PDB file of C-alpha atoms in Angstrom:
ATOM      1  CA  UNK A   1      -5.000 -21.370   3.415  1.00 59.34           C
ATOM      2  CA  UNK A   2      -4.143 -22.670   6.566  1.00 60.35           C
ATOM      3  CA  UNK A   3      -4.405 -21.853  10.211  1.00 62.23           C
ATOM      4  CA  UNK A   4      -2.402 -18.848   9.234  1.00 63.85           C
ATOM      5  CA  UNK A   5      -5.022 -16.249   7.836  1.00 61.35           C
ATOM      6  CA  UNK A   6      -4.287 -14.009   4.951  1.00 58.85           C
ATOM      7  CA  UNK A   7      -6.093 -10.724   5.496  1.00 56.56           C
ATOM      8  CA  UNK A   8      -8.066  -8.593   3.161  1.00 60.29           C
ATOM      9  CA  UNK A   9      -6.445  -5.935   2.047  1.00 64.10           C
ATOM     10  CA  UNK A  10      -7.740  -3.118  -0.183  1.00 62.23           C
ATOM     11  CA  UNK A  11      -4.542  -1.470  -2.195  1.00 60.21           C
ATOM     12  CA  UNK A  12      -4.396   1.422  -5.112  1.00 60.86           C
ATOM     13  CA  UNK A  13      -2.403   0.668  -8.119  1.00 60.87           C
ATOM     14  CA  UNK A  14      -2.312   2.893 -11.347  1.00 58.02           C
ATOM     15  CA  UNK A  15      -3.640  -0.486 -13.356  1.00 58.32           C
ATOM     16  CA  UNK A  16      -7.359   0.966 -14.662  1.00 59.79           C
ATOM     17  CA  UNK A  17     -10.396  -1.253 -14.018  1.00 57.98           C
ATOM     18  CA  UNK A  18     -10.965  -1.508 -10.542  1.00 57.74           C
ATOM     19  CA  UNK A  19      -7.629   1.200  -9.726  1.00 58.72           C
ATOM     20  CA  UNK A  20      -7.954  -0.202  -6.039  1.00 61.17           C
ATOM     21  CA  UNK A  21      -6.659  -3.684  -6.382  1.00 60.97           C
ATOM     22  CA  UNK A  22      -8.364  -5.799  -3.566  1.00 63.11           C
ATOM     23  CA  UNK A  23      -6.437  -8.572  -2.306  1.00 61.48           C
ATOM     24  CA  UNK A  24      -6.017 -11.152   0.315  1.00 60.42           C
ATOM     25  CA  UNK A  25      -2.777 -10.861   1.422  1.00 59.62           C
ATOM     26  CA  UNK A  26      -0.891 -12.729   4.561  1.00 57.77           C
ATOM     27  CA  UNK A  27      -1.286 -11.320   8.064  1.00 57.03           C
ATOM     28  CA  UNK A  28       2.424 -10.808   8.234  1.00 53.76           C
ATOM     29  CA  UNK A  29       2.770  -9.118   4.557  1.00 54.04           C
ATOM     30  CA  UNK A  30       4.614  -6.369   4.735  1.00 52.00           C
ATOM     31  CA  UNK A  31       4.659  -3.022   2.399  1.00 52.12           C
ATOM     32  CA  UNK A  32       7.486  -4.860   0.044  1.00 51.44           C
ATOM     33  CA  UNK A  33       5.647  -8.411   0.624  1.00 48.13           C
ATOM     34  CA  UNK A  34       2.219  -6.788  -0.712  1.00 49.60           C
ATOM     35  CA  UNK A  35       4.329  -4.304  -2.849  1.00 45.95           C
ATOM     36  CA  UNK A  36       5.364  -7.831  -4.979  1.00 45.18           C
ATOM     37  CA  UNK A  37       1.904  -9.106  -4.110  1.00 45.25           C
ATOM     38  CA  UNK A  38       0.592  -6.483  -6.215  1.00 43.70           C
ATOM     39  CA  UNK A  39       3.506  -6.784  -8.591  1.00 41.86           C
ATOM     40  CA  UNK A  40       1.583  -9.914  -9.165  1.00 37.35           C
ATOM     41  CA  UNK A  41      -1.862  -8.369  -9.484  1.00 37.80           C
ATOM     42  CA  UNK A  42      -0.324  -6.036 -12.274  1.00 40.75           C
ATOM     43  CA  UNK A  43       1.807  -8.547 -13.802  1.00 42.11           C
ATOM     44  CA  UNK A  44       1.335  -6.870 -17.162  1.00 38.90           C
ATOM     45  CA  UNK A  45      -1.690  -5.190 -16.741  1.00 37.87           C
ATOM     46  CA  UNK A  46      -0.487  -1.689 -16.989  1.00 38.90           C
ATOM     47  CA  UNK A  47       2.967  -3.030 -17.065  1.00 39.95           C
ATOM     48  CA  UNK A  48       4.155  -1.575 -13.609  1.00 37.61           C
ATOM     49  CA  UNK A  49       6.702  -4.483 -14.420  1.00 35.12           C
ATOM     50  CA  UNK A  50       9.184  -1.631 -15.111  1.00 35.19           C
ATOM     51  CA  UNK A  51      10.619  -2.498 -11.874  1.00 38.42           C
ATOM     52  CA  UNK A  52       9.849  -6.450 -11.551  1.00 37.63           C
ATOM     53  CA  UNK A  53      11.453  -6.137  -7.962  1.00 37.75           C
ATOM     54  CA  UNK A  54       9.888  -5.151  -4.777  1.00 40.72           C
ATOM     55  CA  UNK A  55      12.776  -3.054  -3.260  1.00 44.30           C
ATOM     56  CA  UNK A  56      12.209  -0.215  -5.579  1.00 44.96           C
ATOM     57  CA  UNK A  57       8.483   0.338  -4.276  1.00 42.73           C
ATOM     58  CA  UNK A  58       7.370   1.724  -0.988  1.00 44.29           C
ATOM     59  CA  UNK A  59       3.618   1.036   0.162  1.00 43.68           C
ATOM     60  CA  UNK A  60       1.096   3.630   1.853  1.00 46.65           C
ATOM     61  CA  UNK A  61      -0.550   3.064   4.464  1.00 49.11           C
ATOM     62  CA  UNK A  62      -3.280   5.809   3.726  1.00 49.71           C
ATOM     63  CA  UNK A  63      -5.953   5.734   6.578  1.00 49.34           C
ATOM     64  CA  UNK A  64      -8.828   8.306   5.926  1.00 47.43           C
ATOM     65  CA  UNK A  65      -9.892  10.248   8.701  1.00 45.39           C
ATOM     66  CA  UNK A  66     -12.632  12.711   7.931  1.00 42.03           C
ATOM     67  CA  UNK A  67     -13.289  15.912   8.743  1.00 38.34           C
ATOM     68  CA  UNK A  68     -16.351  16.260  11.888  1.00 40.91           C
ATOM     69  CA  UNK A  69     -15.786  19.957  11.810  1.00 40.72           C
ATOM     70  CA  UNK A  70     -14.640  22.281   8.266  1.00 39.49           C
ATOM     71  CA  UNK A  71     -11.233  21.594   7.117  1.00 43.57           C
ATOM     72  CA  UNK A  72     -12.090  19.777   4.067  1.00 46.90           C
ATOM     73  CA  UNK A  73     -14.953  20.277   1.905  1.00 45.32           C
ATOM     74  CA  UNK A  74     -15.088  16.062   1.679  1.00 44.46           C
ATOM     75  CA  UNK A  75     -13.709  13.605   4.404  1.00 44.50           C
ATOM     76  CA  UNK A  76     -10.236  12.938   3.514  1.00 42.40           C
ATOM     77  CA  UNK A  77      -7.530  10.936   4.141  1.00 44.89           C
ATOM     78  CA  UNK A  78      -4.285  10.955   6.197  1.00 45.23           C
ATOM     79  CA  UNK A  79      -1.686   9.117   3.831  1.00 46.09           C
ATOM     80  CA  UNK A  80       1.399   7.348   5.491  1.00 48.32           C
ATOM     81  CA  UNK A  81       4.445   5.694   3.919  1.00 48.09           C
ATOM     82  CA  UNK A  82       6.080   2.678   4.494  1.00 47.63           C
ATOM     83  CA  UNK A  83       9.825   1.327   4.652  1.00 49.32           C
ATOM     84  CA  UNK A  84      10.411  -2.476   3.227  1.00 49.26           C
ATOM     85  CA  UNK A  85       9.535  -3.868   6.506  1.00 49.18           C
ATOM     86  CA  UNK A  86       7.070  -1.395   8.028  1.00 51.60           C
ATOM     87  CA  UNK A  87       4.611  -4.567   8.512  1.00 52.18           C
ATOM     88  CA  UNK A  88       1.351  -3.825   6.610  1.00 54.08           C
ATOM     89  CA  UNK A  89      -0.824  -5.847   8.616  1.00 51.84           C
ATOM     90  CA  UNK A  90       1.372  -3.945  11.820  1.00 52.76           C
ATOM     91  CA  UNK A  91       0.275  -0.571   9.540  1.00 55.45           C
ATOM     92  CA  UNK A  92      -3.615  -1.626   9.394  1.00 58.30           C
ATOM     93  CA  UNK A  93      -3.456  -2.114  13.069  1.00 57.92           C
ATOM     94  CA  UNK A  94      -2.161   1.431  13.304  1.00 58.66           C
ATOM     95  CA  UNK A  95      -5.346   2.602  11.817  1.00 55.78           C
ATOM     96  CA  UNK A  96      -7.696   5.299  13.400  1.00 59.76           C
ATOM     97  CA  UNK A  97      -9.752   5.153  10.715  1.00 58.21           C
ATOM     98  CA  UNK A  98     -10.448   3.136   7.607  1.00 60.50           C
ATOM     99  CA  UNK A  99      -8.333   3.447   4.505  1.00 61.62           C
ATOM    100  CA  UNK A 100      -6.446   1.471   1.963  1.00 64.31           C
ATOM    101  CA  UNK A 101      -2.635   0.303   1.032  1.00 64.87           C
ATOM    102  CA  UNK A 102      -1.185   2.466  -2.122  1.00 65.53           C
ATOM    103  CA  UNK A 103       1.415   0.906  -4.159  1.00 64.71           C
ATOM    104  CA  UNK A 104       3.785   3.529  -4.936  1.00 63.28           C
ATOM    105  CA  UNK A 105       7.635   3.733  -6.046  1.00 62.92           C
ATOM    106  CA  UNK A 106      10.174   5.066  -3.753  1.00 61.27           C
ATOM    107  CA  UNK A 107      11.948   6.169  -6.434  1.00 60.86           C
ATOM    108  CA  UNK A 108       8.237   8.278  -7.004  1.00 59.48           C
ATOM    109  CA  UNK A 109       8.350   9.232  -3.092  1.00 60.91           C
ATOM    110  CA  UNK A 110      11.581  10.532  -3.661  1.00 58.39           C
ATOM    111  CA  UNK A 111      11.733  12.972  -0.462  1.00 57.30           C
ATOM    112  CA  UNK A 112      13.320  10.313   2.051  1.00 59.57           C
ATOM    113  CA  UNK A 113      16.764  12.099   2.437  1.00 58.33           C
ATOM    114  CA  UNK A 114      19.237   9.871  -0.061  1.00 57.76           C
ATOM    115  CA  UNK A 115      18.704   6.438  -0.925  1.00 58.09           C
ATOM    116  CA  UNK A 116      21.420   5.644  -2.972  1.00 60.76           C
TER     117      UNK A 116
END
């Protein structure tokens, strides 16, 4: 609470009640700043404290962009994913539609070459 703004951002976790955790989160979050932000949200919830650190998470930036013509038999959504300092509010700006953060592991989006 200042002159600098957190935004609103709307973010999936696997914690039930409410499974997309809205938040207000700062302007210049990015995925692992809102990855720990959530970490927060979920602090024991459904336990996603597994991994108490933000550097084993990667965030989506999921933006859903329906179908005008028959591709999908329901709009859907055109999922992205993020690296530690993809900028989340630089992510929501990317947006051609309107979608939501996911909180996911990296170690769970395991198809990003090696990491280790």
């Amino acid at each position: 609470s200042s002159e600098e703004e957190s935004f609103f951002v709307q973010v999936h976790d696997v914690s039930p009640e409410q499974p997309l955790t809205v938040i207000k989160a700062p302007r210049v979050s990015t995925a692992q700043d809102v990855i720990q932000q959530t970490l927060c949200k979920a602090k024991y919830s459904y336990s996603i404290l597994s991994n108490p650190n933000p550097s084993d998470y990667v965030l989506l930036e999921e933006v859903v962009k329906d179908t005008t013509n028959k591709k999908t038999t329901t709009p859907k959504s055109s999922q992205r994913v993020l690296l530690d300092q993809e900028c989340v509010f630089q992510a929501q700006s990317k947006w051609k539609g309107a979608g939501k953060f996911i909180l996911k592991l990296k170690e769970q989006v395991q198809a990003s070459r090696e990491d280790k």
